[PDB]
Amino acid sequence: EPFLIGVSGGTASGKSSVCAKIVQLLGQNEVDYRQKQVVILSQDSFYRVLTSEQKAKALKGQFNFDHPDAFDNELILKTLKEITEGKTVQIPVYDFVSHSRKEETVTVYPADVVLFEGILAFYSQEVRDLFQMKLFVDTDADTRLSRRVLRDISGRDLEQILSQYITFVKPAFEEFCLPTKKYADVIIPRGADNLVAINLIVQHIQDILN
Amino acid sequence: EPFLIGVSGGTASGKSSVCAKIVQLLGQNRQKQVVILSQDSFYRVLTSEQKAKALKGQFNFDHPDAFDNELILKTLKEITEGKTVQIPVYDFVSHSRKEETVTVYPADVVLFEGILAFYSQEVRDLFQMKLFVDTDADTRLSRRVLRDISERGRDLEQILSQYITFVKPAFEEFCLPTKKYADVIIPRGADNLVAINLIVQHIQDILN
Amino acid sequence: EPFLIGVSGGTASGKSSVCAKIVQLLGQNEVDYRQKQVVILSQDSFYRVLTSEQKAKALKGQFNFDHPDAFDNELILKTLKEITEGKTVQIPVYDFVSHSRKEETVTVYPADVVLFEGILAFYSQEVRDLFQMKLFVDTDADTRLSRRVLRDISERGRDLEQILSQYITFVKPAFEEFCLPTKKYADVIIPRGADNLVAINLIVQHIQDILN
Amino acid sequence: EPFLIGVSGGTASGKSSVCAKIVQLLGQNEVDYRQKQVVILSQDSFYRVLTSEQKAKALKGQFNFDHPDAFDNELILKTLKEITEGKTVQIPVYDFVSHSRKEETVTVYPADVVLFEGILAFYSQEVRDLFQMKLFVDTDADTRLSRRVLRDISERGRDLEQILSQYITFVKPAFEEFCLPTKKYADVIIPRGADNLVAINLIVQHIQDILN
C-alpha cells in the first residue's frame, strides 16, 4: 500500500514549500502526472461546500476558513482511505467565488508515497491514524506573520491582512492547530530553508522508492 | 523614601501606554507625586563609528549594550535617596546627549519603564514592585508594523528584515528571560483596564 | 453588590494558598463567621454527583476529576448569581466515597468580597462573566509537579510511581487541554504563588479599599 | 571524513536512550570495540578539572555542573576535530567526586558515524559548527522531572527533597538559561524520546545509508 505522510503546521510555516521541495529534490516534477511515484495533497483542496447560512457569514466576511468546521473532514477521510486501498482518487477544485466545487476535478493516480499537508491534518483522529509518518513544521508565529504579510501584499491591503490575522488566524491557529503538534513523530523547524531536514526526509522516501 | 516601580515588557507590548494611562488616571499630568522614567532616555552616547552603523540601520538599539546601565543604576539610587536628579535628553540626530536636561524632583512614586528594566540585578533590586507587560510576539509585531509604517513612515521590508535580524533575537535573549523576575504580570497591555486600575488605586493608597 | 473575584491556576500553582493568605492578611481569620467580609469559595466543593457509569470508572481510578465534566457548572452558576443578589447561599459538601453530596451543607453569609477559586474557574463564559476581576496563578508545570509530589507522599501517603503515573495520565493532559487555555481571560497573572508577597499584598490592599 | 551527529536536549529528555537505541538497532552492540562504525560520545565525559575555588563551591554543594563553565570546551573541541582528522582518540573519565580526570581513559578508534550527546552540545559555536546534523530531543519539563525523580531515587538512594531542591535551585535555571535556547540551532526536533520509534527509525536508516 502507499506510504502516507501527514504534514502540518501553521500557515506560512513552510509546510508547503517543504513538501514542494521534497518532491522536486526527488525529481518528481520531471515525471508525468500519470506515472508519478510521489504526490502532494493539500487540505486546502477539501474545503466544505458551504451551506446557505455559512455563505451568509462569509458574505459578511465573518466565516473563519481556518476553523476545523471549514474542512470536509469526512471527504478527507474517505479520500485517504481510498488511496490506501490503492484506488485512484478525485481531488476537487474549489470555487471560492460560489463556495462550492467546480465540476473540474484533479486525478491522482495511485502513488507509492503520499504527502498530505494542511493546518489541521492531525486534528481528526481517523485522519491522523492513516498517516504512517507525522511531521509538524514548527515556526514561530513571529516569523510566520512576517512571511504572511510579505506574501499577501506582494495584492492585499496591509490593514486588512493584519486585521484578518489578529481577528481570525491567530485565534484559530492557537486553538486547533498548535495543540496537534503533540501528534508529530518528527518536528521540522523553520521550514523550506532547513536543508538538513528536507534531505533527511527525501532520503527516507527514496529508500522506500527502492 | 520614593517607592520605585519597575515596568518591563517588549516594545509595542503596551508598557509605555500603560504607564501613561496610570499617571493620566491619577491626573498627575515640580509638584508631581508620581512620575515616569523611561529607559529610552539613557542610551549611550554613540561613537562616530557606531553612528555610521545607525544611519545604515546597522545599530541594535535593543541590545543591553545600547543603554548606559551605570547612569541608570546611579540615577535610580539617588532617586531612592530622595535626591532630585537630572535625566538626560537624548538627541538621535547626533546620537549624543543634549546640553539641556530634564529635572525630576523627589516624587513619592517613580515608574521606571524599559525593555530591559529587569536586566541588571542591581537596578532590579531597587524596585519595590516589578511589573511585566506581556503580549504575544504575534500581536506585538502587528502593532509594531502598523506603527512604524503609519506613524514613522518606514519601508515594510526593512521593518520585518530588521525585526527578524535584530529585534526578535534581542527580545528573546535579553528581555523575555527577565519576565520571571516580575511580581505581577499584566497581559495584553493598555486595554487591560482592570489591571491598570489595580496599579492606580495602589499608587493612590501610597500617596495617602 | 458583592465584589466577585475569580481565581484560577493549576493544582499546586498556589492559588489556594494565595486566597488563604489574602483573607489572613486582612484579619478576616479574626472576624466572626456571621460577619466575615471576604470569603473563599472552591470550585471543588461543587463536584458533580456522578452517574452509575462515572462512579464505576472512578472506582477503577479512571475518571479524570480534572475534566470539566467533573464539575457541576449549573449549580456553580446558580449559587454565584444568588451571591450577586446579596442572598445567603448554601454550599454543598462532597463525599468522595459515595461520590455524591452529604446532607450537611455549609452556609455562607453575604460578604462584601468573594474569592471563587478553582482549576476551571474561567472555563464557562457565564460563570466567568460574573467575576469583576480575573486572577490566574501561573506556576511552571515544573515547580507545580515538584510541589505535588512532596505534598502527596507526606499527607496523601501515596507512593511516587502512583503520584507520577496519575500526573502523566490525568493531570497534565487535563491541565493543558482545559485549564491552561483559560489563562487568556485573566486580568492579572500572579506568578509562582503564595510566596509572591508583592502580588499578595496588592490584591489585599485593593480589597480593603472595597471594604472601605 | 567521519559524519558527526550532535544530539542535545535536557537531562532525562531521552537523548541518551535515543542514542543508545540507535546504535542498538544498528547492531553495533555485537561489534568489537575496534570494529565499530558508529559510536557515542557524552559531553558528560568532558567535565572540566575544577580549580581550588570551584571545588570549594562544589564542596558546599554550590557548583552548578549544568552550567556551561562545567564543561571543557577545549578538550571537546580538540577531541572532535581529531576524530574528524580520522585520528584515534582517548576519552577522559571523570570522578564527579574529586572533580578531576583519572589517568584511566577510554579508547575510540576512527568511526564513520559519531554521536556527540549533551545538554550543552550546541552551546559553543566552535563545537556546534562541526556537526553535520544537529538533533534536539524535546521533552516537556514536567515529564522530564518525572523520569529524573524515578531514576535518581533508585540509584543514589538520594532523599526526594534533596533531588527536588537541587532541581529547582540548579537544574531548572540552568536548563532554561542555557540548554533550551540552543534548540533553535537544531536541524531536527525529536519529541518525547526513546519511545518515538518513527523518529528513531528515521535516524537509524539515514545512518545506515551513510554506512553504504
mmCIF file of N, CA, C and O in Angstrom, chain A residues 63-127:
data_model
loop_
_atom_site.group_PDB
_atom_site.id
_atom_site.type_symbol
_atom_site.label_atom_id
_atom_site.label_comp_id
_atom_site.label_asym_id
_atom_site.label_seq_id
_atom_site.Cartn_x
_atom_site.Cartn_y
_atom_site.Cartn_z
ATOM 1 N N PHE A 63 -16.705 34.419 8.265
ATOM 2 C CA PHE A 63 -16.602 32.956 8.244
ATOM 3 C C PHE A 63 -15.130 32.554 8.283
ATOM 4 O O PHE A 63 -14.390 32.785 7.325
ATOM 5 N N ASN A 64 -14.714 31.940 9.384
ATOM 6 C CA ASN A 64 -13.325 31.537 9.551
ATOM 7 C C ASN A 64 -12.985 30.257 8.792
ATOM 8 O O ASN A 64 -13.411 29.170 9.184
ATOM 9 N N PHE A 65 -12.211 30.376 7.716
ATOM 10 C CA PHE A 65 -11.838 29.190 6.954
ATOM 11 C C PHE A 65 -10.673 28.419 7.568
ATOM 12 O O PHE A 65 -10.209 27.436 6.996
ATOM 13 N N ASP A 66 -10.198 28.867 8.726
ATOM 14 C CA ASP A 66 -9.130 28.157 9.403
ATOM 15 C C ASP A 66 -9.735 27.293 10.503
ATOM 16 O O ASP A 66 -9.048 26.471 11.113
ATOM 17 N N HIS A 67 -11.030 27.475 10.748
ATOM 18 C CA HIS A 67 -11.730 26.691 11.761
ATOM 19 C C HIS A 67 -11.867 25.246 11.266
ATOM 20 O O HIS A 67 -12.004 25.000 10.066
ATOM 21 N N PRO A 68 -11.814 24.268 12.181
ATOM 22 C CA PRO A 68 -11.951 22.881 11.722
ATOM 23 C C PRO A 68 -13.268 22.590 10.988
ATOM 24 O O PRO A 68 -13.352 21.609 10.253
ATOM 25 N N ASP A 69 -14.278 23.442 11.177
ATOM 26 C CA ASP A 69 -15.582 23.263 10.517
ATOM 27 C C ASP A 69 -15.530 23.570 9.023
ATOM 28 O O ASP A 69 -16.342 23.070 8.253
ATOM 29 N N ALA A 70 -14.590 24.416 8.623
ATOM 30 C CA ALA A 70 -14.463 24.792 7.222
ATOM 31 C C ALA A 70 -13.966 23.643 6.349
ATOM 32 O O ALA A 70 -14.024 23.726 5.123
ATOM 33 N N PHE A 71 -13.493 22.569 6.978
ATOM 34 C CA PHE A 71 -12.976 21.426 6.228
ATOM 35 C C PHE A 71 -13.906 20.222 6.194
ATOM 36 O O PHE A 71 -14.548 19.889 7.189
ATOM 37 N N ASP A 72 -13.955 19.573 5.033
ATOM 38 C CA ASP A 72 -14.796 18.403 4.814
ATOM 39 C C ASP A 72 -14.125 17.165 5.420
ATOM 40 O O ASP A 72 -13.659 16.271 4.706
ATOM 41 N N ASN A 73 -14.087 17.128 6.748
ATOM 42 C CA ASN A 73 -13.474 16.034 7.483
ATOM 43 C C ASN A 73 -13.797 14.655 6.936
ATOM 44 O O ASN A 73 -12.917 13.801 6.846
ATOM 45 N N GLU A 74 -15.051 14.424 6.572
ATOM 46 C CA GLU A 74 -15.427 13.111 6.063
ATOM 47 C C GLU A 74 -14.885 12.828 4.669
ATOM 48 O O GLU A 74 -14.379 11.735 4.408
ATOM 49 N N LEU A 75 -14.970 13.806 3.775
ATOM 50 C CA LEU A 75 -14.466 13.596 2.424
ATOM 51 C C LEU A 75 -12.971 13.285 2.466
ATOM 52 O O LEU A 75 -12.464 12.458 1.694
ATOM 53 N N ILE A 76 -12.270 13.953 3.378
ATOM 54 C CA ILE A 76 -10.841 13.756 3.528
ATOM 55 C C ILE A 76 -10.572 12.326 3.971
ATOM 56 O O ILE A 76 -9.721 11.646 3.402
ATOM 57 N N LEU A 77 -11.303 11.868 4.981
ATOM 58 C CA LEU A 77 -11.121 10.508 5.472
ATOM 59 C C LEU A 77 -11.401 9.515 4.345
ATOM 60 O O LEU A 77 -10.605 8.609 4.082
ATOM 61 N N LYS A 78 -12.534 9.711 3.676
ATOM 62 C CA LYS A 78 -12.936 8.861 2.563
ATOM 63 C C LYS A 78 -11.834 8.795 1.519
ATOM 64 O O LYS A 78 -11.347 7.716 1.176
ATOM 65 N N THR A 79 -11.443 9.960 1.021
ATOM 66 C CA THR A 79 -10.405 10.052 0.006
ATOM 67 C C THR A 79 -9.090 9.385 0.402
ATOM 68 O O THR A 79 -8.471 8.699 -0.411
ATOM 69 N N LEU A 80 -8.654 9.589 1.640
ATOM 70 C CA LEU A 80 -7.405 8.986 2.084
ATOM 71 C C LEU A 80 -7.515 7.469 2.157
ATOM 72 O O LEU A 80 -6.594 6.760 1.751
ATOM 73 N N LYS A 81 -8.637 6.969 2.666
ATOM 74 C CA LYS A 81 -8.829 5.523 2.757
ATOM 75 C C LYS A 81 -8.763 4.894 1.370
ATOM 76 O O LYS A 81 -8.109 3.868 1.177
ATOM 77 N N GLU A 82 -9.437 5.517 0.410
ATOM 78 C CA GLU A 82 -9.447 5.022 -0.962
ATOM 79 C C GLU A 82 -8.043 4.973 -1.566
ATOM 80 O O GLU A 82 -7.706 4.040 -2.296
ATOM 81 N N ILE A 83 -7.219 5.969 -1.257
ATOM 82 C CA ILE A 83 -5.855 5.986 -1.770
ATOM 83 C C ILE A 83 -5.047 4.871 -1.114
ATOM 84 O O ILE A 83 -4.108 4.345 -1.709
ATOM 85 N N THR A 84 -5.417 4.518 0.114
ATOM 86 C CA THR A 84 -4.734 3.457 0.845
ATOM 87 C C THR A 84 -5.000 2.138 0.143
ATOM 88 O O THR A 84 -4.092 1.327 -0.059
ATOM 89 N N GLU A 85 -6.262 1.935 -0.220
ATOM 90 C CA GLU A 85 -6.679 0.728 -0.915
ATOM 91 C C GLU A 85 -5.994 0.650 -2.281
ATOM 92 O O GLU A 85 -6.169 -0.317 -3.019
ATOM 93 N N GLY A 86 -5.211 1.671 -2.612
ATOM 94 C CA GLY A 86 -4.515 1.682 -3.886
ATOM 95 C C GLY A 86 -5.356 2.169 -5.054
ATOM 96 O O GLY A 86 -4.888 2.199 -6.196
ATOM 97 N N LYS A 87 -6.600 2.552 -4.774
ATOM 98 C CA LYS A 87 -7.504 3.045 -5.811
ATOM 99 C C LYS A 87 -7.060 4.415 -6.299
ATOM 100 O O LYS A 87 -6.105 4.994 -5.782
ATOM 101 N N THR A 88 -7.761 4.924 -7.302
ATOM 102 C CA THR A 88 -7.466 6.241 -7.842
ATOM 103 C C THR A 88 -8.496 7.176 -7.224
ATOM 104 O O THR A 88 -9.644 6.783 -7.008
ATOM 105 N N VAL A 89 -8.088 8.404 -6.924
ATOM 106 C CA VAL A 89 -8.992 9.359 -6.299
ATOM 107 C C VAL A 89 -9.177 10.635 -7.102
ATOM 108 O O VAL A 89 -8.361 10.974 -7.960
ATOM 109 N N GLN A 90 -10.261 11.341 -6.802
ATOM 110 C CA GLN A 90 -10.585 12.582 -7.485
ATOM 111 C C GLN A 90 -10.523 13.761 -6.518
ATOM 112 O O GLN A 90 -11.410 13.949 -5.683
ATOM 113 N N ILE A 91 -9.466 14.553 -6.631
ATOM 114 C CA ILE A 91 -9.297 15.708 -5.768
ATOM 115 C C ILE A 91 -10.047 16.887 -6.363
ATOM 116 O O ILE A 91 -9.766 17.324 -7.479
ATOM 117 N N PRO A 92 -11.024 17.415 -5.617
ATOM 118 C CA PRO A 92 -11.852 18.551 -6.033
ATOM 119 C C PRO A 92 -11.109 19.876 -6.145
ATOM 120 O O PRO A 92 -10.108 20.104 -5.467
ATOM 121 N N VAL A 93 -11.602 20.745 -7.019
ATOM 122 C CA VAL A 93 -11.011 22.061 -7.199
ATOM 123 C C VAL A 93 -12.059 23.021 -6.679
ATOM 124 O O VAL A 93 -13.175 23.074 -7.195
ATOM 125 N N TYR A 94 -11.692 23.774 -5.649
ATOM 126 C CA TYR A 94 -12.611 24.700 -5.003
ATOM 127 C C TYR A 94 -12.837 26.027 -5.711
ATOM 128 O O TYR A 94 -11.892 26.690 -6.143
ATOM 129 N N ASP A 95 -14.110 26.401 -5.814
ATOM 130 C CA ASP A 95 -14.516 27.656 -6.434
ATOM 131 C C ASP A 95 -14.841 28.615 -5.302
ATOM 132 O O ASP A 95 -15.974 28.681 -4.825
ATOM 133 N N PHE A 96 -13.831 29.348 -4.859
ATOM 134 C CA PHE A 96 -14.022 30.302 -3.781
ATOM 135 C C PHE A 96 -15.099 31.342 -4.059
ATOM 136 O O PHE A 96 -15.610 31.966 -3.132
ATOM 137 N N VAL A 97 -15.439 31.543 -5.327
ATOM 138 C CA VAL A 97 -16.451 32.529 -5.667
ATOM 139 C C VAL A 97 -17.828 32.092 -5.182
ATOM 140 O O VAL A 97 -18.495 32.822 -4.451
ATOM 141 N N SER A 98 -18.248 30.898 -5.585
ATOM 142 C CA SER A 98 -19.549 30.374 -5.189
ATOM 143 C C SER A 98 -19.482 29.582 -3.890
ATOM 144 O O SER A 98 -20.515 29.286 -3.290
ATOM 145 N N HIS A 99 -18.264 29.252 -3.458
ATOM 146 C CA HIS A 99 -18.051 28.486 -2.228
ATOM 147 C C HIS A 99 -18.587 27.069 -2.392
ATOM 148 O O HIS A 99 -19.163 26.481 -1.473
ATOM 149 N N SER A 100 -18.380 26.550 -3.595
ATOM 150 C CA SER A 100 -18.791 25.217 -3.994
ATOM 151 C C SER A 100 -17.601 24.642 -4.755
ATOM 152 O O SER A 100 -16.567 25.296 -4.879
ATOM 153 N N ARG A 101 -17.742 23.429 -5.268
ATOM 154 C CA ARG A 101 -16.647 22.816 -6.006
ATOM 155 C C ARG A 101 -16.915 22.850 -7.506
ATOM 156 O O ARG A 101 -17.975 22.415 -7.963
ATOM 157 N N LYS A 102 -15.952 23.366 -8.267
ATOM 158 C CA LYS A 102 -16.083 23.423 -9.717
ATOM 159 C C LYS A 102 -16.240 21.994 -10.203
ATOM 160 O O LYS A 102 -15.801 21.056 -9.536
ATOM 161 N N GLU A 103 -16.858 21.823 -11.363
ATOM 162 C CA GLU A 103 -17.039 20.489 -11.920
ATOM 163 C C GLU A 103 -15.653 19.893 -12.185
ATOM 164 O O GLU A 103 -15.461 18.676 -12.124
ATOM 165 N N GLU A 104 -14.690 20.767 -12.461
ATOM 166 C CA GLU A 104 -13.323 20.351 -12.742
ATOM 167 C C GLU A 104 -12.651 19.734 -11.521
ATOM 168 O O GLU A 104 -12.540 20.378 -10.475
ATOM 169 N N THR A 105 -12.207 18.485 -11.657
ATOM 170 C CA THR A 105 -11.524 17.786 -10.568
ATOM 171 C C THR A 105 -10.069 17.521 -10.949
ATOM 172 O O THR A 105 -9.643 17.837 -12.061
ATOM 173 N N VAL A 106 -9.314 16.950 -10.014
ATOM 174 C CA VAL A 106 -7.908 16.619 -10.228
ATOM 175 C C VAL A 106 -7.732 15.127 -9.990
ATOM 176 O O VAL A 106 -8.113 14.612 -8.940
ATOM 177 N N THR A 107 -7.160 14.432 -10.965
ATOM 178 C CA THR A 107 -6.953 12.993 -10.840
ATOM 179 C C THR A 107 -5.594 12.697 -10.226
ATOM 180 O O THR A 107 -4.584 13.270 -10.633
ATOM 181 N N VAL A 108 -5.572 11.807 -9.240
ATOM 182 C CA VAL A 108 -4.324 11.429 -8.595
ATOM 183 C C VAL A 108 -4.145 9.926 -8.708
ATOM 184 O O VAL A 108 -4.696 9.158 -7.917
ATOM 185 N N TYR A 109 -3.377 9.512 -9.707
ATOM 186 C CA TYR A 109 -3.136 8.098 -9.923
ATOM 187 C C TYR A 109 -2.425 7.510 -8.710
ATOM 188 O O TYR A 109 -1.611 8.181 -8.075
ATOM 189 N N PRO A 110 -2.738 6.250 -8.363
ATOM 190 C CA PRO A 110 -2.114 5.588 -7.215
ATOM 191 C C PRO A 110 -0.616 5.854 -7.179
ATOM 192 O O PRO A 110 0.090 5.642 -8.168
ATOM 193 N N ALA A 111 -0.140 6.332 -6.035
ATOM 194 C CA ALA A 111 1.273 6.640 -5.869
ATOM 195 C C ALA A 111 1.906 5.785 -4.777
ATOM 196 O O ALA A 111 1.207 5.155 -3.985
ATOM 197 N N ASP A 112 3.235 5.771 -4.747
ATOM 198 C CA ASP A 112 3.978 4.999 -3.761
ATOM 199 C C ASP A 112 4.036 5.712 -2.415
ATOM 200 O O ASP A 112 3.984 5.078 -1.363
ATOM 201 N N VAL A 113 4.145 7.036 -2.460
ATOM 202 C CA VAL A 113 4.210 7.854 -1.258
ATOM 203 C C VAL A 113 3.281 9.048 -1.431
ATOM 204 O O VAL A 113 3.268 9.687 -2.487
ATOM 205 N N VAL A 114 2.503 9.351 -0.398
ATOM 206 C CA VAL A 114 1.581 10.471 -0.468
ATOM 207 C C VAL A 114 1.789 11.464 0.662
ATOM 208 O O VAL A 114 1.731 11.107 1.836
ATOM 209 N N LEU A 115 2.033 12.715 0.292
ATOM 210 C CA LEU A 115 2.239 13.774 1.254
ATOM 211 C C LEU A 115 0.961 14.582 1.360
ATOM 212 O O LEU A 115 0.576 15.282 0.418
ATOM 213 N N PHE A 116 0.293 14.466 2.503
ATOM 214 C CA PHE A 116 -0.931 15.214 2.748
ATOM 215 C C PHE A 116 -0.572 16.296 3.751
ATOM 216 O O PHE A 116 -0.189 15.998 4.888
ATOM 217 N N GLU A 117 -0.694 17.551 3.336
ATOM 218 C CA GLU A 117 -0.366 18.650 4.222
ATOM 219 C C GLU A 117 -1.514 19.625 4.412
ATOM 220 O O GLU A 117 -2.236 19.945 3.472
ATOM 221 N N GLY A 118 -1.671 20.092 5.646
ATOM 222 C CA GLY A 118 -2.719 21.042 5.977
ATOM 223 C C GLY A 118 -2.601 21.503 7.420
ATOM 224 O O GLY A 118 -2.004 20.812 8.246
ATOM 225 N N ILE A 119 -3.175 22.662 7.727
ATOM 226 C CA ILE A 119 -3.129 23.209 9.080
ATOM 227 C C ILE A 119 -3.840 22.361 10.110
ATOM 228 O O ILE A 119 -3.585 22.491 11.296
ATOM 229 N N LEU A 120 -4.733 21.489 9.669
ATOM 230 C CA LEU A 120 -5.468 20.663 10.610
ATOM 231 C C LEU A 120 -5.393 19.195 10.218
ATOM 232 O O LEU A 120 -6.295 18.409 10.502
ATOM 233 N N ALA A 121 -4.287 18.835 9.575
ATOM 234 C CA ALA A 121 -4.043 17.469 9.131
ATOM 235 C C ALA A 121 -4.117 16.475 10.282
ATOM 236 O O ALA A 121 -4.616 15.366 10.119
ATOM 237 N N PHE A 122 -3.622 16.872 11.449
ATOM 238 C CA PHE A 122 -3.622 15.983 12.603
ATOM 239 C C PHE A 122 -4.837 16.138 13.517
ATOM 240 O O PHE A 122 -4.977 15.385 14.485
ATOM 241 N N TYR A 123 -5.713 17.090 13.203
ATOM 242 C CA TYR A 123 -6.890 17.365 14.017
ATOM 243 C C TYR A 123 -7.850 16.200 14.238
ATOM 244 O O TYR A 123 -8.255 15.949 15.368
ATOM 245 N N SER A 124 -8.238 15.519 13.164
ATOM 246 C CA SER A 124 -9.152 14.379 13.261
ATOM 247 C C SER A 124 -8.371 13.111 13.603
ATOM 248 O O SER A 124 -7.322 12.854 13.018
ATOM 249 N N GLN A 125 -8.865 12.312 14.542
ATOM 250 C CA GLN A 125 -8.133 11.097 14.891
ATOM 251 C C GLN A 125 -8.111 10.049 13.766
ATOM 252 O O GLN A 125 -7.083 9.411 13.530
ATOM 253 N N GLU A 126 -9.228 9.869 13.066
ATOM 254 C CA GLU A 126 -9.268 8.897 11.975
ATOM 255 C C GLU A 126 -8.335 9.299 10.838
ATOM 256 O O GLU A 126 -7.726 8.444 10.198
ATOM 257 N N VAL A 127 -8.232 10.593 10.568
ATOM 258 C CA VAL A 127 -7.332 11.036 9.512
ATOM 259 C C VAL A 127 -5.886 10.824 9.976
ATOM 260 O O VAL A 127 -5.020 10.381 9.219
#
